[PDB]
Design an enzyme around this catalytic site. Structure first.
Site, mmCIF file in Angstrom:
data_model
loop_
_atom_site.group_PDB
_atom_site.id
_atom_site.type_symbol
_atom_site.label_atom_id
_atom_site.label_comp_id
_atom_site.label_asym_id
_atom_site.label_seq_id
_atom_site.Cartn_x
_atom_site.Cartn_y
_atom_site.Cartn_z
ATOM 1 N N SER A 197 -3.703 6.378 -3.479
ATOM 2 C CA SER A 197 -3.988 5.214 -2.625
ATOM 3 C C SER A 197 -5.500 4.999 -2.556
ATOM 4 O O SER A 197 -6.131 4.796 -3.587
ATOM 5 C CB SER A 197 -3.385 5.425 -1.224
ATOM 6 N N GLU A 324 6.063 0.825 -3.351
ATOM 7 C CA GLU A 324 4.790 0.926 -2.652
ATOM 8 C C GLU A 324 4.668 0.124 -1.349
ATOM 9 O O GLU A 324 3.927 0.520 -0.456
ATOM 10 C CB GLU A 324 3.658 0.496 -3.594
ATOM 11 N N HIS A 437 5.469 4.984 -0.665
ATOM 12 C CA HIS A 437 4.050 5.135 -0.935
ATOM 13 C C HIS A 437 3.625 6.540 -0.500
ATOM 14 O O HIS A 437 3.858 6.935 0.636
ATOM 15 C CB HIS A 437 3.309 4.083 -0.115
#
Lengths: 532, 532
Positions: A197, A324, A437
């Site tokens: 991320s 995600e 995610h």
């Protein structure tokens, strides 16, 4: 003593830790910068002054001051991401896991945590480097860096809060690794930086920034790239947000000096309590204080840097998760709930689209809505839910990473792409969220190898495969074993664009990861918003 | 005598004609208007003056002056559409097929031929009304009307060439049917007008135009609707094209009087030789002289008429063919050929898109290209060919007809929709063209019932089903037999939007005919072109 190491900053004392019925050395909380407190807040980091005696590195350091998620008190699913140590502005430390017996010159892997540039800790249980360091025999380093306003407040033009100081923290930790990892058995000419991320976006930024390029050999980016729409802002928007932050705390706004000084007198929690009030739009997947295109760390715009090949040329391994976006819809989009199937109506769908592409005019919102709606079944609650999920993930993570990979591959020396689509069997989050995610992290760090966590045998096997891919890539620049008999992870090329799925099924190679949507998000929509 | 009929215009003498080993009466070439020649060219039509004696109506009349396709000399595929009689400006006549023995008051069907408003004849072999009149026992009428500049030159504001005179011709023939069909055994209160392509667009225009509404009961529209992007122009574009026509023939352009007079001195073929030079853009599926939104025939814009319910409310039956566009690509798009598979490259694809949506800016061309490209296989010659085929058909025929049907159904008293997707077994055109524009006509007129033409038994059965649907609908306003046991053609409603396929397979009901694309062509693109 195996636990005693003499570095250029002074002597350090680690501790022995058990791992999978064996042991390795751990050096926790080694300082790499002077504590950024008082007059040093918002300022670039300075090197930690050498110390006499022995630094006790047997316990985790404090975590940086940050926003703490309380949307689900007690819930392990979200609290496993929260700081597990006392927060403090004095947080620039790093952690090292070293095999036993201590290596002479082995591969090094430096982890950079994610968290939207507003949160994150190097001490979370999912980031325990002992499993990976033990299983693959590599020196594992996890660093820390200031987040939120403390690491990204940007008032371009002043040396008191230039911006990007959070990235400089990372660079400083990398400089220390480059200068001292040899004393821990690591090879400084073979360091791979990897992150997820915001951490993946950070890794991409070090690849782009001239001042960081010489500090590492290879890189791995998980669900994040430097050109993501949330990873950076202009100096103007940076300035605008810094001023608005000051206005929420009733600060003198006549000059930068005035504002900065007033912000430095505030307690940490005072800035954190109003940090979210500065966003320009009602939005999802957008954060207040992030990196800024300043002309220093980043010479020019990212797009021009990517087109001109102005970046470190080496090998890279990267990919994304299947779903995600579900995490950001759960927390901020009307209609979604943790305890229900979250079937979304037409109403909430269009409401979600407006929240996901905040910068879009009405023509743009319509383009998106049309691109993700099945008009033969438009009131299907499940199709609207997954449709919103795809939008958030494609726009924020997948399409931006595909743009980067295709731009990079034209000048790089090797690219390997993956698509992680296995939903862990022990996930506590609801089913509708899918392959969430950040949940590929636990496989990368080998949590499945520990029985008491409750993973299946195929998940343990998947974790070893991934650990061996990441580690083998870190060592050689190719995730594949030289003469193996196992299935080969093909190289991603401009022509074929091959990639593999990463799950418990027999490997399968594919091509052009979500091209239809990436062309929409990277070529068409930008053009539409620019013309109208 | 069965062949002698006394109408309000005078006596007419028909002829007996054989049909499927039987016989019926035919009255060919009955005049319904004064010959539009000399000073009458471009002028509104005037009623034919009554005549003494008997009008010999045993042979077909002349065909209107028109452009003649010579792209494939000798080829039956294209020549079956060309005029099969001497052309002449003296062409306003109609044809009637009457059952034997002569009916007392039976259902009437009036056919309006298509041809892009620039061509067409009522005397083509595919329009022989004897089969349909015989098989279904209906009085079949086919009329004629001026096409090209002769019927659509428009210089709004002057009474010498007002425009839409071609539509007034049709209306005049309908007025005659209303006033005289009773003498041929037809019921004037039960006349259904039906047509294909420009003829279908004409039928829709009579439904909209106040002055035509009282002249018929029901309507059938085949592959054409009034709101098609090629079926009409503004008074300004009409004026612009009329002037440019005059410029190609070196005419005095100082005043309308000057231009008109100069154009009336030209031989018919002189205007036809330059008629195509006035189009505003390099294009496909666009014609020079078509109906014009003048404020008389059409009170206001078509879109506002459709939204306000300003139109005849009755029952309608309509539909389209699977591959409406292949014909226009063959004749005018680079890459297509009659004797090859016509696999199209990326180059020619984008070239085709520019030719199909001539009025689109660059952002628009990109929207279309993205909407019809499969980016996982973009150089697939067959996908680009069919993709171009769909674009031309969707934009020009299908999406415009779906807009009309959905707007009409909100105020109508019954709608029946079909999708014709059967490719005749004896087609001489190549396979890649599929279910071609205009080839459902032969099934409507029953050509398959005649052995010597070489259709299969299932095609003969399909023709009888369609003839019985069209005829039953003409008689009752419902294509279905009251108490039949056969499969039911459901009614199209605003809610379900049901429609049926029309082929040799067991009937199948579907919903939302090409919605995905219709939303793109009717809602999104127009908005995009208007904002940018």
């Amino acid at each position: 003593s195996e636990l005693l190491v003499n570095t250029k900053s002074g002597k350090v004392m680690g501790t022995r830790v058990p791992v999978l019925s064996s042991h390795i050395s751990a050096f926790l909380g080694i300082p790499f910068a002077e504590p950024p407190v008082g007059n040093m807040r918002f300022r670039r980091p300075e090197p930690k002054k050498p110390w006499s005696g022995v630094w006790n590195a047997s316990t985790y350091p404090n975590n940086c001051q940050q926003y703490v998620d309380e949307q689900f008190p007690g819930f392990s699913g979200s609290e496993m991401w929260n700081p597990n140590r006392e927060m403090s502005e004095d947080c620039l430390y790093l952690n090292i896991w070293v095999p036993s017996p201590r290596p002479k010159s082995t591969t090094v892997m430096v982890w950079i945590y994610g968290g939207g540039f507003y949160s994150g800790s190097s001490t979370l249980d999912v980031y325990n480097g002992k499993y990976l360091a033990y299983t693959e025999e590599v020196v594992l380093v996890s660093l820390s860096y200031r987040v939120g306003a403390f690491g990204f407040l940007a008032l371009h033009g002043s040396q008191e809060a230039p911006g990007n100081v959070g990235l400089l923290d990372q660079r400083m930790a990398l400089q220390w690794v480059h200068d001292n990892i040899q004393f821990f058995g690591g090879d400084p000419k073979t360091v791979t930086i990897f992150g997820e991320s915001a951490g993946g976006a950070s890794v991409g930024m070090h690849i782009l920034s001239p001042g960081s390029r010489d500090l590492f050999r290879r890189a791995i980016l998980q669900s994040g790239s430097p050109n993501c729409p949330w990873a950076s802002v202009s100096v103007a928007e940076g300035r605008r947000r810094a001023v608005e932050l000051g206005r929420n705390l009733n600060c003198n706004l006549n000059s930068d000096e005035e504002l900065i000084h007033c912000l430095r007198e505030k307690k940490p929690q005072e800035l954190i309590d109003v940090e979210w009030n500065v966003l320009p739009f009602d939005s999802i997947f957008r954060f207040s204080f992030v990196p800024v295109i300043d002309g220093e760390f980043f010479p020019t715009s990212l797009e021009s840097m990517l087109n001109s090949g102005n970046f470190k040329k080496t090998q890279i391994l990267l990919g994304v998760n299947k779903d995600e976006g579900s995490f950001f819809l759960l927390y901020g989009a009307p209609g979604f709930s943790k305890d229900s199937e979250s079937k979304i109506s037409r109403e909430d769908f269009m409401s979600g689209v407006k929240l996901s592409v905040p910068h879009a005019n009405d023509l743009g919102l319509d383009a998106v809505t049309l691109q993700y709606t099945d008009w033969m079944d438009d009131n299907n609650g499940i199709k609207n839910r997954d449709g919103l999920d795809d939008i958030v993930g494609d726009h924020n993570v997948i399409c931006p990473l595909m743009h980067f990979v295709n731009k990079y591959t034209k000048f790089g020396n090797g690219t390997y792409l993956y698509f992680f689509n296995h939903r862990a069997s022990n996930l506590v989050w609801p089913e509708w969220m899918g392959v969430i995610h950040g949940y590929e992290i636990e496989f990368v760090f080998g949590l499945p190898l520990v029985k008491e966590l409750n993973y299946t045998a195929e998940e343990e096997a998947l974790s070893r495969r991934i650990m061996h891919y990441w580690a083998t890539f870190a060592k050689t620049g190719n995730p594949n074993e030289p003469h193996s008999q196992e299935s080969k992870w093909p190289l991603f090329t401009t022509k074929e664009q091959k990639f593999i799925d990463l799950n418990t099924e027999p490997m399968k190679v594919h091509q052009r990861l979500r091209v239809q949507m990436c062309v929409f998000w990277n070529q068409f929509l930008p053009k539409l918003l620019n013309a109208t």
